[PDB]
Write an enzyme that holds these catalytic residues in place. Structure first.
Site, short mmCIF file in Angstrom:
data_model
loop_
_atom_site.label_atom_id
_atom_site.label_comp_id
_atom_site.label_asym_id
_atom_site.label_seq_id
_atom_site.Cartn_x
_atom_site.Cartn_y
_atom_site.Cartn_z
N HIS A 134 0.81 -1.23 0.00
CA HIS A 134 0.00 0.00 0.00
C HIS A 134 0.84 1.27 0.00
O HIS A 134 0.26 2.35 -0.03
CB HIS A 134 -0.98 -0.01 1.20
CG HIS A 134 -0.47 0.29 2.61
ND1 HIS A 134 -0.19 -0.58 3.54
CD2 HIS A 134 -0.26 1.55 3.16
CE1 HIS A 134 0.18 0.08 4.61
NE2 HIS A 134 0.14 1.38 4.41
N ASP A 188 0.25 -7.72 1.84
CA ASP A 188 0.71 -6.31 1.80
C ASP A 188 2.27 -6.26 1.83
O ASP A 188 2.88 -5.96 2.85
CB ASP A 188 0.11 -5.56 2.99
CG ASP A 188 0.30 -4.03 2.89
OD1 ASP A 188 0.62 -3.47 1.86
OD2 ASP A 188 0.10 -3.36 3.88
N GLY A 192 2.56 6.68 8.47
CA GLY A 192 3.92 7.23 8.22
C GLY A 192 4.94 6.14 8.54
O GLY A 192 6.06 6.18 8.05
N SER A 213 4.11 2.90 8.04
CA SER A 213 3.76 1.84 7.04
C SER A 213 4.96 1.44 6.18
O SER A 213 5.69 2.32 5.75
CB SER A 213 2.69 2.33 6.08
OG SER A 213 1.46 2.34 6.79
N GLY A 214 5.11 0.16 5.94
CA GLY A 214 6.21 -0.37 5.11
C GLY A 214 7.48 -0.60 5.89
O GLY A 214 8.37 -1.29 5.42
N1 LIG Z 1 -2.25 1.41 14.34
C1 LIG Z 1 -1.25 0.97 13.59
N2 LIG Z 1 -0.37 0.08 14.04
C2 LIG Z 1 -1.11 1.46 12.28
C3 LIG Z 1 0.05 1.13 11.54
C4 LIG Z 1 0.24 1.60 10.25
C5 LIG Z 1 -0.72 2.39 9.72
N3 LIG Z 1 -0.80 2.96 8.58
C6 LIG Z 1 -1.91 3.61 8.56
C7 LIG Z 1 -2.28 4.40 7.48
N4 LIG Z 1 -3.25 5.27 7.66
C8 LIG Z 1 -3.69 6.08 6.72
C9 LIG Z 1 -3.11 6.04 5.46
C10 LIG Z 1 -2.07 5.13 5.21
C11 LIG Z 1 -1.63 4.29 6.23
O1 LIG Z 1 -0.60 3.38 5.99
N5 LIG Z 1 -2.63 3.49 9.67
C12 LIG Z 1 -1.85 2.72 10.39
C13 LIG Z 1 -2.08 2.27 11.68
#
Ligand SMILES: NC(=[NH2+])c1ccc2[nH]c(-c3ncccc3[O-])nc2c1
Ligand SMILES: [Ca+2]
Ligand SMILES: [Cl-]
Length: 223
Positions: free
Chosen positions: A40, A84, A175, A177-178
């Protein structure tokens, strides 16, 4: 990262920042020309930034390399976020040193209770957005599959695992993510999704990397 601490400059040498004019996702360096991130986080115009600590200041040790191609898993489902994972090949190989180093892929899956290190430049507030300049770290354990499925009924596939704290307060967030989830020196997860950030009984969900090692090896071997 919410509830985490400042890692310290270059203490997580395999951490990379995916940049398109601003930091939008993290990733992990697995060899000198390949990075693993989340499907994503895919977009065109990606510049991979290695050796970073403050992403808004050139402090030395940084290597900015453009992505030559990004390979999203063919079975990635954007609605369930199943599979993912994405591989990014760099236009040139990175110069590895003590500040930029790759992380090993696992030979076995980790068990519940394993303590891991999650890192990133994502949001640090559960209610609102504060984005840090330097890299944040969080030590979190892998939860049992029963607690994970009990927290997200019908949304956990066998390619996902939960890690974190059910009491709330410490978690990865947008932020991040990845980015990497490293346990015992091996890359076991990729930051994927969660409900809000650091909410009680809503742990973070991670892509289970041990399920994709042959796919990563075969894909890198043919590209
Ligand atoms: N609670 C978590 N551990 C989490 C982790 C990664 C995320 N990434 C996102 C996310 N939100 C909005 C747009 C892109 C995203 O990767 N929410 C997230 C929540
Ligand atoms: Ca910098
Ligand atoms: Cl279920």
């Amino acid at each position: 990262i919410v509830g985490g601490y400042t890692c310290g400059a270059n203490t997580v040498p395999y951490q990379v920042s995916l940049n398109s004019g601003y930091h939008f996702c993290g990733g992990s360096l697995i060899n000198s020309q390949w990075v693993v991130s989340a499907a994503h986080c895919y977009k065109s115009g990606i510049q991979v930034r290695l050796g970073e600590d403050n992403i808004n200041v050139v402090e030395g040790n940084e290597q900015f390399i453009s992505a030559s191609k990004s390979i999203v898993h063919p079975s990635y489902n954007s609605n369930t976020l199943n599979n993912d994972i994405m591989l990014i090949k760099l236009k040139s190989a990175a110069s590895l040193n003590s500040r930029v180093a790759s992380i090993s892929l696992p030979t076995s899956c980790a068990s519940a209770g394993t303590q891991c290190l999650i890192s990133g430049w994502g949001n640090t507030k559960s209610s609102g957005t504060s984005y840090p300049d330097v890299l944040k770290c969080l030590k979190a354990p892998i939860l049992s599959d029963s607690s994970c499925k009990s927290a997200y009924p019908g949304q956990i596939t066998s390619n996902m695992f939960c890690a974190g704290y059910l009491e709330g307060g410490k978690d990865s967030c947008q932020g991040d993510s990845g980015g990497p989830v490293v346990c015992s020196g091996k890359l076991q997860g990729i930051v994927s999704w969660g409900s809000g950030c650091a909410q009680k009984n809503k742990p973070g969900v991670y892509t289970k990397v041990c399920n994709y090692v042959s796919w990563i090896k075969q894909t890198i071997a043919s590209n």
